[PDB]
Each structure stands twice: as structure tokens, then as C-alpha cells.
A paper describes a structure:
In this work, we have studied the binding and determined the structures of two antigen-specific Fabs derived from human monoclonal antibodies raised against [name], one of the components of the meningococcal B vaccine Bexsero. [name] is a lipoprotein that is specific to Neisseria species, and its gene is ubiquitous in all meningococcal group B strains. As part of the analyses of these Bexsero-specific antibodies and in an attempt to increase the structural characterization of [name], we selected two mAbs (named 12E1 and [name]) which, according to preliminary epitope-mapping studies, bind to the [name] N-terminal region between residues 1 and 300. In this work, we describe the preparation of the complexes between [name] and Fabs 12E1 and [name], the characterization of their high-affinity interactions and the determination of the crystal structures of apo Fab 12E1 and Fab [name] at 2.7 and 1.5 Å resolution, respectively.
Author numbering:
A (entry chain L): 6 to 216
B (entry chain H): 1 to 128, 134 to 214
Write the structure that this text describes.
Amino acid sequence: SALTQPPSVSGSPGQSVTISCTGTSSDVGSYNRVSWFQQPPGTAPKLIIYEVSNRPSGVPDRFSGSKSGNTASLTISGLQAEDEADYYCSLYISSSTWVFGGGTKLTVLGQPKAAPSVTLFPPSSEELQANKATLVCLISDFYPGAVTVAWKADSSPVKAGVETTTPSKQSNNKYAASSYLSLTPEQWKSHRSYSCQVTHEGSTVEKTVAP
Amino acid sequence: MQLVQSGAEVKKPGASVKVSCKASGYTFTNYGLHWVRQAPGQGLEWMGWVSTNNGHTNYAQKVQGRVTMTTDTSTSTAYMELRSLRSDDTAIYYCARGVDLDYWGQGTLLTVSSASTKGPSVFPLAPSGGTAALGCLVKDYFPEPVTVSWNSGALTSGVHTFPAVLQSSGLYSLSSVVTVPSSSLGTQTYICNVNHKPSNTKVDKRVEP
């Protein structure tokens, strides 16, 4: 990425935030076809600014663009929760060549804290019959979007076999995550219970299952 | 109005791939097209530009010599061939319209790996407020994605299919859960329908108490 963007920016609803796109006098300082793109997770980019300051029809008026010196700037004047996305600048630098900035992740604060809901499943009969065993810990509806997960065999820490996803935003703007524990059928039968312990903003909750 | 890209591709290192981008709802030959890729968790990277009316192309230094961009005006389709594939060519490939990149296709996933496609193994997650959670565990497939429906799409309320985990095996797993009335268990039948297009597999699994 020959253009430099801040990795992340954040603000609260109603605030103004500006995302920079910095080059040199040879590129940003010399050319004017700057585009900005808004990219929701798992979505194609969407054009939201072209030629430094123009908004495609339909793009909210709170998005604006400018350029000064070797930096182009995307400004969101009055943040809304729906503005969370990754944002990218690009620049046409003649000779049929385009270059992109590295991207900026925008966080909009101010959603209320929500504790996770946890569902824990034991290994299925069928999987055990296949000489495998997976415990499944499903974590949903939490905010902010960070958790840590620890597993216990009876009351001892489990040091092997754990896989845990990064949290991702649900359609209700809360977050979901999953954790899986791989065991042998023998390990699963040999303990009194296993627990999935989910820690969110300092608070640890749990589910326990037994064979 | 529309840019529709071809299906996902799984290739070994050293192979070639050719992906396509079909335009409609506008005058194809009035706008050039770009190819832009995005490696997992990384930024947009411009690959090149191809004119639809004057025969010109220009490619990113990064892929110069092993990319070819062409068009077929008979079907308004643009093609990008990438040769001598390497692992870090693994990315979603987008086509985009015009000099400002004003409209984008939905993307084509290219996975370049020495590992082969692998379809999933599916296991039932039996049910244990008056409601019960039951589900399906979709284990050890590659690459993404899997989709899951319930009762062939007749059951939609209360379904939550979770994002996949990438495991230390290099394979993915996910779960789909549905919350139902407890009274329903043993009078209603629950079947998850799991689709893994990369391996051309579909799995049905009945979930019983």
C-alpha cells in the first residue's frame, strides 16, 4: 500500500472523525482522482467519495472528502452506529495506474454492555462412535466484541485441543463467537465434567456438561 | 447496474486460474474494468486495468508477467488469468467498473494450497423458558464456506449459524443451532441441510432427542 492510513479510528455517536490517506508530493500532492470506499465485513467495497470531494447519489451527507498537501481526508460529520466498516482511499496516478491506502477500521462506541449467552454441547453419540469427541461452546449477543475462553476438565485447566474464533458482529449489532474442545472419547468419559468458562469485561460465566 | 463474478476456485501452487466478471445493465464498452484483490484480513490491492473499447491494459508491477486481462464483447464478460500461482495469491478477487471504481462485483475466492478440497462430516447436537436448543456440528471441511438450512428451508425462525473456526488441522468447523419449543421434541422432525459447494457435497442430518 503506497498510501498510508491509520489502522483504526474511533468515536461516539454525533462526533466528527477524519480518516487520513497520506502519500508524497509525487502522488497525492500531484493528482486529484482520490476515491474512498466503505467496506462492511464480508461485503464488496462501496464507493462513497470520488474526485476528492464528490458523493455518489444516495451516500449520506455526513460523508465528505478533502485534500491538502500530500494527504487526502475522509470526514464523517456526526457518526452513526451504521458507519462501522473498513474504509480505503485510492488514487489514480496517470499511466493507467491506481494505488490503494492500507485501510482504516472505524469503531463507533456507545452501545450498552451486554453479557454473553452461552450454550454448551457434549460430544454426540455418533462422533464418539467414530472415536472422536468435540465439545461445542456457542457464545452470543455480547457487547463489547471481545471475550476470552478457558476450558476446565473437572476443575483443572485444559491445555490442549482448544480452538476459539475471533468475535464477529451479528445482525443485531451484538457479537458472536465459538469455542471447540477436542478430546479422546476416553478423556471425555474419564472426567466427572467439563466446563466452558467465558470471560467478558472482567465477568466470567459458564456452562458445564457431564457424560 | 450489475457485475457478476464466477465461482470460487481451488488451485495448487504453480497452476493457473482464469476468473470472469459478467457485466449487465449498462453499456459494456463505455467503461474500462479493474481487478482488485484482498488477501484474508488484509487491504485492497489493485491488480490492473483493462479497456473494453481500445485494447489497452496495464498491470501492477506485482503481477506483471503472469496476468492476462481480456474481454469478450459477445457476452459482456471480462476475464483475468493469473499464472504460476503461489500460496499468497490466496484472496478474494473483485472486478470494478470505470475510472473511479464506482461499482464492484461480489468477488471470487481463490484458494491456492497444496491441500485438497474436503467436504464436511456432520454430527447432531441433541437437545437436552419452555425452549430447547438443538443443532448440527459441521466438522473438518476446506475451504470456506458451508451454508446450513433446517428442514429444507421450512424452518427459519430461531436459527443461528455461527462463523467457522479455522482449526490447527488447517480445516474449518462450524455449528448451526435452532431454538424450538420443548414440547415439539419427538413430534416434530428436525433435519439440518449442509451445503459445501467447493467439494460438491450436501449432507442431511436428523437431530433427535
